[PDB]
Amino acid sequence: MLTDPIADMLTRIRNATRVYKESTDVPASRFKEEILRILAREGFIKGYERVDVDGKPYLRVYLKYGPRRQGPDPRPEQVIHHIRRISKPGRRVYVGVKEIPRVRRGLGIAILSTSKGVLTDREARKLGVGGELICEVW
Amino acid sequence: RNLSALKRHRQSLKRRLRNKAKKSAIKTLSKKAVQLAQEGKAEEALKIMRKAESLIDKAAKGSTLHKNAAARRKSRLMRKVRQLLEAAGAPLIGGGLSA
Amino acid sequence: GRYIGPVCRLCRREGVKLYLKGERCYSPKCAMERRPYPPGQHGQKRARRPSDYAVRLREKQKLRRIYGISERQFRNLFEEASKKKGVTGSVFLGLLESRLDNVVYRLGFAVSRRQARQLVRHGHITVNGRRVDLPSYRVRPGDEIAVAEKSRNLELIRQNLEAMKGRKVGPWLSLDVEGMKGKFLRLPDREDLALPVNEQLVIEFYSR
Amino acid sequence: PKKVLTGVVVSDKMQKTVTVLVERQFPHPLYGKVIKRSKKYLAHDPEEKYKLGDVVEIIESRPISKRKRFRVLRLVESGRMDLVEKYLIRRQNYQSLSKRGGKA
Amino acid sequence: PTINQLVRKGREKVRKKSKVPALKGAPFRRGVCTVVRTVTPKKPNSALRKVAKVRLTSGYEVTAYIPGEGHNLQEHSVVLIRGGRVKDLPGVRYHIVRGVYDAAGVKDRKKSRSKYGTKKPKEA
Amino acid sequence: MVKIRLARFGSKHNPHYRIVVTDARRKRDGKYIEKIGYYDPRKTTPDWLKVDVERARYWLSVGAQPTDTARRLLRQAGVFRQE
RNA sequence: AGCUAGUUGGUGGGGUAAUGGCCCACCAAGGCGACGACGGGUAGCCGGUCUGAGAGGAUGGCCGGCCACAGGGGCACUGAGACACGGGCCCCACUCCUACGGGAGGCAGCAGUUAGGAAUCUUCCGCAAUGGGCGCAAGCCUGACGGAGCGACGCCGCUUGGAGGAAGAAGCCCUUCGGGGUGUAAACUCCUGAACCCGGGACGAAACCCCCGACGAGGGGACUGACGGUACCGGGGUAAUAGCGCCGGCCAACUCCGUGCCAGCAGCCGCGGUAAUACGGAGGGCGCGAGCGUUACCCGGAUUCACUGGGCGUAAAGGGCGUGUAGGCGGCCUGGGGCGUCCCAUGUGAAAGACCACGGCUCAACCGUGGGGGAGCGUGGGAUACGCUCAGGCUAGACG
RNA sequence: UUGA
RNA sequence: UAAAAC
Ligand SMILES: [K+]
Ligand SMILES: [K+]
Ligand SMILES: [K+]
Ligand SMILES: [K+]
Ligand SMILES: [K+]
Ligand SMILES: [K+]
Ligand SMILES: [K+]
Ligand SMILES: [K+]
Ligand SMILES: [K+]
Ligand SMILES: [K+]
Ligand SMILES: [K+]
Ligand SMILES: [K+]
Ligand SMILES: [K+]
Ligand SMILES: [K+]
Ligand SMILES: [K+]
Ligand SMILES: [K+]
Ligand SMILES: [K+]
Ligand SMILES: [K+]
Ligand SMILES: [K+]
Ligand SMILES: [K+]
Ligand SMILES: [K+]
Ligand SMILES: [K+]
Ligand SMILES: [K+]
Ligand SMILES: [Mg+2]
Ligand SMILES: [Mg+2]
Ligand SMILES: [Mg+2]
Ligand SMILES: [Mg+2]
Ligand SMILES: [Mg+2]
Ligand SMILES: [Mg+2]
Ligand SMILES: [Mg+2]
Ligand SMILES: [Mg+2]
Ligand SMILES: [Mg+2]
Ligand SMILES: [Mg+2]
Ligand SMILES: [Mg+2]
Ligand SMILES: [Mg+2]
Ligand SMILES: [Mg+2]
Ligand SMILES: [Mg+2]
Ligand SMILES: [Mg+2]
Ligand SMILES: [Mg+2]
Ligand SMILES: [Mg+2]
Ligand SMILES: [Mg+2]
Ligand SMILES: [Mg+2]
Ligand SMILES: [Mg+2]
Ligand SMILES: [Mg+2]
Ligand SMILES: [Mg+2]
Ligand SMILES: [Mg+2]
Ligand SMILES: [Mg+2]
Ligand SMILES: [Mg+2]
Ligand SMILES: [Mg+2]
Ligand SMILES: [Mg+2]
Ligand SMILES: [Mg+2]
Ligand SMILES: [Mg+2]
Ligand SMILES: [Mg+2]
Ligand SMILES: [Mg+2]
Ligand SMILES: [Mg+2]
Ligand SMILES: [Mg+2]
Ligand SMILES: [Mg+2]
Ligand SMILES: [Mg+2]
Ligand SMILES: [Mg+2]
Ligand SMILES: [Mg+2]
Ligand SMILES: [Mg+2]
Ligand SMILES: [Mg+2]
Ligand SMILES: [Mg+2]
Ligand SMILES: [Mg+2]
Ligand SMILES: [Mg+2]
Ligand SMILES: [Mg+2]
Ligand SMILES: [Mg+2]
Ligand SMILES: [Mg+2]
Ligand SMILES: [Mg+2]
Ligand SMILES: [Mg+2]
Ligand SMILES: [Mg+2]
Ligand SMILES: [Mg+2]
Ligand SMILES: [Mg+2]
Ligand SMILES: [Mg+2]
Ligand SMILES: [Mg+2]
Ligand SMILES: [Mg+2]
Ligand SMILES: [Mg+2]
Ligand SMILES: [Mg+2]
Ligand SMILES: [Mg+2]
Ligand SMILES: [Mg+2]
Ligand SMILES: [Mg+2]
Ligand SMILES: [Mg+2]
Ligand SMILES: [Mg+2]
Ligand SMILES: [Mg+2]
Ligand SMILES: [Zn+2]
């Protein structure tokens, strides 16, 4: 058993991209799927899709990267130079709308889970609501 | 030395005595009444009970008891009295107690 | 209060020309002209590479010494400038520049700042017709700075205000050489002033 | 408004008085983690109406005694010693914490 | 530590021990001299540093350095202690205030005078 | 009894009072119940005396007793004019 | 690390303005504690204050709010109110009177004395102003207060001069002995004119009161200033206090002589044993300036107790291992609830302070006015993603 | 032996 | 060799 599926996911991703994988499977849950959408729309990953491995539901997550590069070490840049978990079991982090942070002066996002669904710090700010600060990506 | 308002003391001692005396009477009569009732002697148990009521209310006219202090006493009195009587019966003189 | 001592030695230390004397500072009789090198028994030896600190110091010393203001008053002004909205550097200068003892100097009633200071003290100056003998008094926009009538006929105010005929006056100021009165038009913009000083360094000195 | 609290009756060895265990949750002031603290209230029960295991509402009342400043508003949920258990046990572990002896 | 841990034990605040039990943390303490010895420097020094055992008002007895070229402190000299150790003589953690009470200022001192209690010499 | 009086707030030689409603027993510069005006005895500005007439009238309506000086100022501001 | 007998609860009383083991009979045998009881130590709490980028740390003097105390202990009387600082009773310690039986007293009110201490003021003026008590009022009382006095203790403003002056006096200091420095600094020339001397001279004070009117609204009139002959205005008018720390690195400022592990310096690293920019003096220089240094103490730098924001193979740090209690934490789907969480409205968040703005003292310090802030908590309404809870389902964890 |  | 010491 995973103690925190959401962190598990952000990591599977963190790890998959650090070795330039093409996709990466993660056990499914609506909530996880919901975050992937934000992740897609913001253009961090190419997208994802429901699949079945060994007969159990997963979520292929097609990752994205920059272009090849010059000089020593041609490995591309990462679209996801960062992806950390904020709230964690046994230390949840909740914020008010005036308390939603601004990741990298806006060049990054923060996915919150509010009583109006899962949204980015901009979306959440817009609808004028706060919630559980899930993670920040940039 | 000599703060002429020693007069306040001088007076408190009088008022003290004046009160102490009014209450001493209230108590004695209250008992007398409670005792008479406790023996079924309704006729006079109330007779005396009324003096007590009257004495109490008068004491409340000035600083002696004044207030709900009186109320409390009249209450606890008629309460004890009516009861000790209704343990033999016959509320004769029907002094202070109603119906 | 105020320095009160050899002022040319200050020019020589900052290596730049400061005008703590008005005339003479223009004449080749100036000390910055004769021996343009630090005062003292070592002013002529090779100056060692100054430390980042020395630089910020010397720079700020320069600016402050230009107005003859005390490190005390000089600092309080800077802290006031910091708090206010707007580029601290600019605001600071506008403030140092709004000092009556200085405005009187800008309007040529005096040849130097140290002189304009004494003019203010000895009541020879006026603000909106009311007397003011506070060198630190802060002139606001619209205020009119004049000369006490009782003073208008002074052997000194003659030359100074006379020699002011046909002379230009800073963009933020207007001078009426006849009525012996000028007007503080607006707070000097950083670019209006041309001081041999880099405020960034100053802002950074008080940063430390 | 008179404060109202909800808890479990963890004792009723007292005449017309039951011990209600109320819990609360709050963000630790510096560390944020939601922590759960709890307190026991001696509520007034004039009819010996409530029993061990009863979850009830307690309401700020006028003093009934030193210590008693609450009355049982109403029964929220009948029997459930699962809660009473935690308590008894947590208190039972106290034995094994001195210089004497108890249980593991 | 985990958060649960910090929630349970929390961090412990750093306490600070004094270098000057001049008691009441008082800036200065008055005392009377016992001895007026001399001491040997340690580590890599050599000289006859002038110390003084002092019985303070604060019910204390401690050694205190006598700064300056030379003093006039006998046995029962009334002195003022000010605190400031002396890297060389372990045990000496205070200084006598030249210029206060029985300890006379320093003579012929023309520079760092406020320290060493020396009035300004007239000149003309 | 409650009162409508002056509370000194200026500074040395620079007195500025506050017309206040405070309990009679309180120190003067102490905790008042309500400010209902102010007064600059040296009338150093065009506005050296303001009074919330509606409010003053309210307190007077419930017992508040003005100082003889506060009564004077309250009058000057038309608290008692009934034309 | 266990605590508890009025102890926890009950019935009936007593008591108070009033609830209540507050107190008393009688009855039950309870109550409290690792979510830290009991004990020990220390301490009046708060608005705020200092510091910090913040989070936080430290703090509670002045001012405002609450509490407690009035030589120490206890008690009640009087009264709307007290268990009463300048009221009462008793015990105690002390001081004073004593014809020895016995009495008198309590500055943690203002001022002052003495003691202790490194250290903290005038036995001042006034009741004019504000406020308070009593009085129908005149008025009386008010060491509350408004003022002055002393102390650079702090903050702010101000002066010890301004302009001209030698390819540059003398003196003093270095020197390649040519000269370099102090330095336009000085003397000088001219100008202004703090101090001081005359003249004028204040706001703060219009009420209470009297008259008219109705003892009201309204109107009219009179008295009253401690600060003070002070502030300030005008006239005249002298060129007239500068000190303190530092100059080896950190750290801005360097040379000669003296001294020779000595005398001494020293915040840390360190410096002095013959040529020391580090000891002492001198010339020169840097910093700051009616102050400048020192000591002590708080925060900072210190992400060095790390929530923001740290670590544990060899640096300090994994428990010798297991079993397991409490606690902490919890896979996937659906539904109810709506505690956590989030949202709107509302109440509260005093004044002062802090922030912004305008304004009053010539400025400022200081002060007045106005505006904007605000976490937390109460109330009403709403949201339901996540956490929690209840109910049902699943098989990917676990177990068989 | 000390110190550098 | 400056000293401690011989
Ligand atoms: K009487
Ligand atoms: K003009
Ligand atoms: K036990
Ligand atoms: K009324
Ligand atoms: K009872
Ligand atoms: K304790
Ligand atoms: K602050
Ligand atoms: K923070
Ligand atoms: K605190
Ligand atoms: K505190
Ligand atoms: K605090
Ligand atoms: K009238
Ligand atoms: K004059
Ligand atoms: K002169
Ligand atoms: K020599
Ligand atoms: K040497
Ligand atoms: K030297
Ligand atoms: K030296
Ligand atoms: K520190
Ligand atoms: K070990
Ligand atoms: K062990
Ligand atoms: K609220
Ligand atoms: K739900
Ligand atoms: Mg009798
Ligand atoms: Mg009465
Ligand atoms: Mg003149
Ligand atoms: Mg029971
Ligand atoms: Mg509770
Ligand atoms: Mg040595
Ligand atoms: Mg020290
Ligand atoms: Mg009126
Ligand atoms: Mg027991
Ligand atoms: Mg009862
Ligand atoms: Mg009762
Ligand atoms: Mg009890
Ligand atoms: Mg304790
Ligand atoms: Mg204490
Ligand atoms: Mg910090
Ligand atoms: Mg700050
Ligand atoms: Mg803070
Ligand atoms: Mg206070
Ligand atoms: Mg005493
Ligand atoms: Mg009474
Ligand atoms: Mg009394
Ligand atoms: Mg007294
Ligand atoms: Mg003494
Ligand atoms: Mg008076
Ligand atoms: Mg009065
Ligand atoms: Mg000379
Ligand atoms: Mg000159
Ligand atoms: Mg003249
Ligand atoms: Mg009068
Ligand atoms: Mg008449
Ligand atoms: Mg009449
Ligand atoms: Mg009138
Ligand atoms: Mg240097
Ligand atoms: Mg020699
Ligand atoms: Mg020697
Ligand atoms: Mg030195
Ligand atoms: Mg030498
Ligand atoms: Mg040096
Ligand atoms: Mg040095
Ligand atoms: Mg810093
Ligand atoms: Mg820290
Ligand atoms: Mg570490
Ligand atoms: Mg080892
Ligand atoms: Mg190790
Ligand atoms: Mg091991
Ligand atoms: Mg468990
Ligand atoms: Mg779950
Ligand atoms: Mg759980
Ligand atoms: Mg659903
Ligand atoms: Mg649910
Ligand atoms: Mg809720
Ligand atoms: Mg609110
Ligand atoms: Mg406020
Ligand atoms: Mg102004
Ligand atoms: Mg305000
Ligand atoms: Mg808010
Ligand atoms: Mg609400
Ligand atoms: Mg609500
Ligand atoms: Mg719902
Ligand atoms: Mg289930
Ligand atoms: Mg098994
Ligand atoms: Zn020049």
| Chain A interface includes E3 (CB < 8 A) | yes
CA gap E32, E41 in Å, rounded: 24
Helix (H) or strand (E) run with residue B96 in it = none
Which among C203, C207, C208 has a CA at the least distance from the CA of C59?
C203
CA gap C185, C170 in Å, rounded: 10
Looking at residue C50, the DSSP 8-state letter turns out to be: P
Helix (H) or strand (E) run with residue B26 in it = helix B7-37
Please state, as a whole number, how many other Cβ atoms lie within 10 Å of the Cβ of residue E89.
17
Question: What does the domain layout of chain E look like in residue ranges?
Answer: 1-124
**Long-range CB contacts (< 8 A, 24+ apart) of D72-76?**
D72/D18, D72/D20, D72/D43, D72/D44, D72/D45, D73/D4, D75/D50, D76/D6
* CA of residue D31 to C1' of nucleotide G307, angstroms: 5
Which among C199, C196, C201 has a CA at the least distance from the CA of C51?
C201
Which positions ≥6 away from D52 have C-beta within 8 Å? D9, D10, D11, D12, D81, D84
Please state, as a whole number, how many other Cβ atoms lie within 10 Å of the Cβ of residue A73.
6
* CATH number at C97-193: 3.10.290.10
Which among C95, C107, C172 has a CA at the least distance from the CA of C137?
C95
Q: What's the count of helices (H) and strands (E) in chain A, helices before strands? A: 3, 7
Annotated binding residue at C90? Answer: no
**Pairing relationship of beta strands F2-8 and F65-66 according to DSSP bridges:** parallel
Host domain of residue F62: 1-83
Residue F68 alpha carbon to ligand 44 centre in Å: 30
Domain containing residue F23: CATH number = 3.30.1320.10
Residue F75 alpha carbon to ligand 52 centre in Å: 20
Question: What does the domain layout of chain A look like in residue ranges?
Answer: 3-80, 81-138
Name the token pair of C151. 């003073």
Amino acid at C71: E
* CA of residue E36 to C1' of nucleotide G278, angstroms: 28
Q: What is the DSSP string of A103-116?
A: GGGGTSEEEEEEBT
Please state, as a whole number, how many other Cβ atoms lie within 10 Å of the Cβ of residue D47.
7
CA A85 to chain centre: 9
**Topology, domain A81-138:** Dna Ligase; domain 1 (3.30.1490)
**Long-range CB contacts (< 8 A, 24+ apart) of D1-5?**
D2/D59, D2/D60, D2/D61, D3/D59, D3/D60, D4/D57, D4/D58, D4/D59, D4/D60, D4/D73, D5/D41, D5/D57, D5/D58, D5/D59, D5/D70
> Phi and psi (nearest 5°) for F20?
-130, 160
> Phi and psi (nearest 5°) for B67?
85, -150
| Chain A interface includes E2 (CB < 8 A) | yes
Looking at residue C138, the DSSP 8-state letter turns out to be: B
Q: Which residues of F66-78 are buried (b: 16+ CB within 10 A; e: fewer)?
A: beeebbebbeebe
Angle (nearest 5°) at CA D11 between D9 and D15: 110
CA gap A27, A8 in Å, rounded: 10
Residue C40 alpha carbon to ligand 49 centre in Å: 14
Q: What CATH class has C1-96+194-208?
A: mainly alpha
First to last CA, chain E: 73
CA gap A12, A9 in Å, rounded: 5
Chain E residues in contact with A91 by the CB 8 A cut-off are 3
Please state, as a whole number, how many other Cβ atoms lie within 10 Å of the Cβ of residue D40.
14
CA gap E97, E67 in Å, rounded: 8
Looking at residue B42, the DSSP 8-state letter turns out to be: H
Using alpha carbons, list the distances in angstroms from residue A111 to A105, A136, A137, D83. 15, 6, 8, 37
**Residue B78 bridge partners (DSSP):** none
F touches which chains (3+ CB pairs under 8 A)?
A: none
CA gap C180, C125 in Å, rounded: 10
User: Within 13 A of B52's CA, how many CA atoms are on the CB side?
Assistant: 27
CA gap C85, A59 in Å, rounded: 52
CA gap C100, C113 in Å, rounded: 10
Amino acid at A65: Y
Give the 3-state secondary structure of residue C122: coil
Give the 3-state secondary structure of residue A28: coil
CA gap D28, B43 in Å, rounded: 73
Name the CATH superfamily housing domain E1-124: Nucleic acid-binding proteins (2.40.50.140)
CB E7 within 8 A of CB D31: yes
Please state, as a whole number, how many other Cβ atoms lie within 10 Å of the Cβ of residue D80.
13
Amino acid at E9: K
Which among D39, D45, D51 has a CA at the least distance from the CA of D5?
D39
CB F60 within 8 A of CB F71: no
CA gap B71, B83 in Å, rounded: 18
CB E84 within 8 A of CB E94: yes
CB A127 within 8 A of CB A119: yes
CB C77 within 8 A of CB C95: yes
**Residue A84 bridge partners (DSSP):** A136
Q: Which architecture, in CATH terms, is A3-80?
A: 2-Layer Sandwich (3.30)
**Domains contained in chain F, number:** 1
CB B65 within 8 A of CB B77: no
CATH pick for D1-104 out of 3.40.50.261, 2.40.50.140, 3.40.50.300, 1.10.8.80: 2.40.50.140
Which positions in strand G are less than 7 Å from the protein's CB atoms? 1-2, 8-11, 13-22, 28-35, 55-58, 63-66, 77-82, 84, 86-88, 104-105, 116-119, 129-133, 144-148, 156-168, 173-174, 180-185, 190-194, 203-208, 216-218, 233-235, 239, 242-246, 250-255, 261-273, 280-299, 304-307, 310-312, 324-334, 339-344, 350, 355-357, 359-364, 366-370, 378-379, 382-387, 396-397
Experimental determination technique: X-ray
Q: What's the count of helices (H) and strands (E) in chain C, helices before strands? A: 10, 5
Name the token pair of C108. 């040529």
Q: What is the DSSP string of A6-21?
A: HHHHHHHHHHHHHTT-
